[PDB]
């Protein structure tokens, strides 16, 4: 009859993430757009903002579906596109964050390279490549979701359809777990280990506000993606009949909801980092630092 | 009983491609491997040759199957792997050709960037990414492939695993990712490059560029009939006579696509004679050219 507590909590988090995410990320795009033609950091934060904004658009449909006990009245096109937006957000944000991390690394260890080659056009090219690879990785996820009808009780479910549930679905879970979480975790941990050791050690090299901001965003990625990944592979290695599988499936909306916090956490981090100046001005200072002075 | 004309033609093409492909690409690997440590072009051509060599390994099985009227005696594992090696060849080849085209572009338009960043380790990293992405693209096709028993007459068939509406979109995604998008992008790329090398005397059209342009053209030339017949069959009814005709022509299309796995050495030898020596010597001059002197 009435909704379960985890689903309710997922609805609350969904609402908050929708408001803060849509308005906040839109404000970020507005602030960074004018400075995006020259400043590199502005290009980074701009792309992260667009990626977070697109995922928020799918929220009202997921909300309506959860209120209707996972009923899906939006059709097959929405079934293929709307759920996939956050997976697209996952790959796009982690790719852009990898590029930004390479930027922060090179600024610290190879200033000479950055003085000669760190231009806006290269940044836009790398961002375009990131979006391309992200969409490429998200395509199978869009193709293989279908709308199915059930009768006990009657309901219309939007879900993944793989006849080889044991063989192929586990492969999807493995690919997502590795490309989306484990590999980025390893490489970025090594990267910021190097960077932070050098920053703490040498007085001549400073910790810029941009570095602290990027570190907070990178941490937030893994923090809010962890439960969805863990439960996600766990539901590939479990029998459907098993009680553990039942529990995790009853927690699914809550995990997706926790993952969606990535789409609104960035404006919070930017504002907190910025703290006699207006909010857009604060964002403009935090998100448009020049790393290489030229004029 | 007797095979149809297209199937015999496919057998002949598979034979020629197996011989020229295995021996030629193996020799190209032998030529480029010693220099792949330092010169980047040798890395490109080495990865290309490996990709075209792997596809030929599955050729004898496909040959044997076509001789037996498309009966499949090799089982499910071979059914999932061997037919799809040509697909892995498709994706790996077009990805490597994409990075190579980006290299030919950067050499012409960004000499200064090439001076600092065109290193062997980066080229090997990009090759690793191309191979991994190619495998990742080939996996879903392999999983859908399956053995299928039939009784009138008895026979074992290897084939794809529904939803018409979904199957159409998947076929369109294959046509775009494997052909149309690479066609558009590479066309624009070499439009800029060739227009520049033609306009400016200071800019030279190097031997490596001519070779690479030839290979890139050969890709679309040989993959075209297969892509067209596939996208056509996905949008046609089985009851349709033209569908049946395309179904008969499938082996010939696979063979003509398989020419991609043996035409590369032919191109290298033709170009090497064209500039005007032992075969390995010619291949070494053509495939190990250094674009940045140090
Ligand atoms: C600057 C981001 C690099 C992404 N990346 C990571 C990467 C690192 C940290 C976090 C996310 C990705 N590991 C490897 C890499 C892996 C093996 C060998 C060589 C390179 C790569 C190289 N990738 C190709 C690429 C090149 C240039 C790009 C690009 C992607 O977008 C922006 O400009 C391949 C790739 C792309 C996305 C991936 C991934 C691998 O695993 C996790 O998700
Ligand atoms: C230099 C290779 C470029 C591949 N590519 C093509 C490409 C071009 C011509 C031929 C083949 C691939 N179009 C786009 C691209 C697409 C949209 C926006 C920005 C870039 C891309 C960027 N891709 C990332 C990547 C892949 C493989 C790599 C790599 C980076 O460095 C090493 O090896 C994503 C990608 C990879 C394979 C694809 C594809 C997209 O669509 C068709 O097949
Ligand atoms: C602080 C947390 C609460 C703040 C705002 C809550 C947003 C409104 C929640 C809507 C839930 C309505 C519902 O249960 O259907
Ligand atoms: C484009 C399709 C998605 C729309 C995303 C953002 C809309 C606004 C983007 C503004 C572009 C500014 C780019 C620039 O001026 O450098
Ligand atoms: C899938 C949606 C991805 C959308 C992300 C891209 C956002 C579009 C906004 C701007 C892109 C075009 C900006 C190109 C500026 C190039 C000139 C320059 O800055 O040197
Ligand atoms: C931070 C950038 C991550 C780059 C990962 C490269 C991995 C590799 O070179 O093997
Ligand atoms: C991995 C393969 C290529 C990525 C190399 C790292 C690129 C550094 C990006 C620097 C920048 O964003 O300005
Ligand atoms: C999806 C593809 C990403 C869309 C827009 C990214 C912007 C690409 C702009 C290319 C700029 C190249 C250059 O400045 O030389
Ligand atoms: C069918 C088109 C697939 C597009 C390629 C995207 C990369 C696929 C990689 C992993 C997906 C899981 C296996 C299916
Ligand atoms: C942008 C939204 C997400 C994009 C990812 C994949 C879209 C490309 C695959 C086609 C999905 C729709 C399939 C269909 O129309 O049946
Ligand atoms: C997909 C990427 C996931 C894992 C790739 C790990 C490969 C590690 C090779 C490192 C060797 C090296 O870079 O020198
Ligand atoms: C120059 C040498 C290395 C550049 C590597 C690109 C920056 C990312 C480093 C992260 C890592 O080492 O895994
Ligand atoms: C995200 C952070 C991940 C790894 C950071 C670990 C390196 C910490 C360096 C601090 C230097 C010190 O404490 O002396
Ligand atoms: C799948 C792995 C996920 C776990 C996180 C990875 C654990 C290792 C992380 C960082 C170890 C890197 C230590 C590098 C030391 C640098 C030495 C120096 O800077 O002087
Ligand atoms: C119950 C789980 C909720 C946890 C919320 C986590 C929010 C993540 C936000 C920021 C992570 C910590 C930021 C640390 C900044 C590091 C700056 C520096 O190292 O100099
Ligand atoms: C909602 C359940 C999880 C709790 C999430 C809490 C969200 C906000 C909490 C902390 C935000 C931390 C922001 C850190 C900004 C670092 C600024 C700096 O660089 O100094
Ligand atoms: C070696 C040349 C093989 C010729 C291929 C064409 C027809 C061969 C048919 C063999 C039947 C057994
Ligand atoms: C499967 C492919 C296995 C082997 C073929 C690749 C051989 C690579 C040799 C590298 C030689 C070198 O770089 O010095
Ligand atoms: C495997 C070793 C190399 C194979 C080379 C030629 C064998 C293929 C020719 C077989 C044709 C006759 C088979 C048959 O009649 O079923
Ligand atoms: C070593 C050979 C270098 C070839 C590099 C070509 C394409 C790399 C693909 C991803 C790098 C983005 C392009 C960087 C740039 O525009 O300079
Ligand atoms: C997006 C999926 C891409 C697949 C991941 C790539 C898998 C390859 C992993 C490691 C290979 C790295 C080896 C290259 C190191 C350079 C060696 C050298 O300098 O000689
Ligand atoms: C990116 C791939 C776009 C190709 C097809 C998407 C729309 C499919 C229409 C059926
Ligand atoms: C064939 C080239 C490599 C594939 C093309 C797509 C990747 C290039 C993306 C953005 C670069 C656009 C700016 C220069 C044209
Ligand atoms: C998607 C379009 C791909 C075709 C463009 C060529 C691909 C080359 C890859 C990267 C080149 C980016 C540099 C472009 C600016 C220099 C070229 C110019 O100014 O004419
Ligand atoms: C007939 C096949 C369909 C058309 C395919 C298009 C292929 C065009 C590709 C490259 C052509 C480049 C255009 C400029 C050529 C200039 C040559 C020169 O002047 O040196
Ligand atoms: C789609 C069709 C792809 C090819 C269409 C080519 C269109 C515009 C490219 C023209 C670029 C002009 C470069 C000038 C180089 C020079 O003259 O030196
Ligand atoms: C059949 C062979 C097709 C491949 C070669 C065809 C055209 C390539 C000609 C390009 C000339 C480059 C100098
Ligand atoms: C140049 C490759 C770009 C994509 C071409 C694919 C379709 C064209 C196929 C065959 C036509 C040959 C076009 C090559 C023109 C070479 C002109 C020259 O170098 O003299
Ligand atoms: C036997 C393989 C099939 C032969 C088909 C066509 C052979 C023509 C090859 C033309 C080579 C052109 C290379 C070049 O122009 O540089």
From Swiss-Prot, chain A:
Modified residues (Phosphoserine): 278, 281, 291
Compartments, record wording: Cell membrane; Cytoplasmic vesicle
Family: Belongs to the G-protein coupled receptor 1 family.
Protein name (Swiss-Prot/TrEMBL): C5a anaphylatoxin chemotactic receptor 1
Chief place of localization: membrane
CDD domains assigned to the protein according to its UniProt record, in alphabetical order: 7tmA_C5aR
Parts of the chain that traverse the membrane: 8-34, 40-63, 81-102, 124-144, 171-196, 213-235, 253-273
């Amino acid at each position: 009859n009435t909704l379960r507590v985890p689903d309710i909590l997922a609805l609350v988090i969904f609402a908050v993430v929708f408001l803060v995410g849509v308005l906040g990320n839109a404000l970020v795009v507005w602030v960074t757009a004018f400075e995006a033609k020259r400043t590199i950091n502005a290009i980074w934060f701009l792309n992260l903002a667009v990626a977070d904004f697109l995922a928020c658009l799918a929220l009202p449909a997921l909300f309506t579906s959860i209120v209707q006990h996972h009923h899906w009245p939006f059709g097959g096109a929405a079934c293929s596109i709307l759920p996939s937006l956050i997976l697209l957000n996952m790959y796009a944000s982690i790719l852009l964050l990898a590029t930004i991390s390479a930027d922060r690394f090179l600024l610290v260890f190879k200033p000479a390279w950055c003085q000669r080659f760190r231009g806006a056009g290269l940044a836009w090219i790398l961002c375009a490549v990131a979006w391309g690879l992200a969409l490429l990785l998200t395509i199978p996820s869009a193709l293989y979701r279908v709308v199915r009808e059930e009768y006990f009780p009657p309901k219309v479910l939007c879900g993944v359809d793989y006849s080889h549930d044991k063989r192929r679905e586990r492969a999807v879970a493995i690919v997502r777990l590795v490309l989306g979480f484990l590999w980025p975790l390893l490489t970025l941990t090594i990267c910021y280990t190097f960077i932070l050791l050098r920053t703490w050690s040498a007085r001549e090299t400073r910790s810029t506000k941009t570095l602290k901001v990027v570190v907070a965003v990178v941490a937030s990625f893994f923090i809010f993606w962890l439960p969805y990944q863990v439960t996600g592979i766990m539901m590939s290695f479990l029998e459907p009949s098993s009680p553990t599988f039942l529990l995790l499936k009853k927690l699914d909306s809550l995990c997706v909801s926790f993952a969606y916090i990535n789409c609104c956490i960035n404006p919070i981090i930017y504002v907190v980092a910025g703290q006699r100046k207006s909010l857009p001005e604060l964002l403009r200072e935090v998100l448009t630092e020049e790393s290489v002075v030229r004029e």
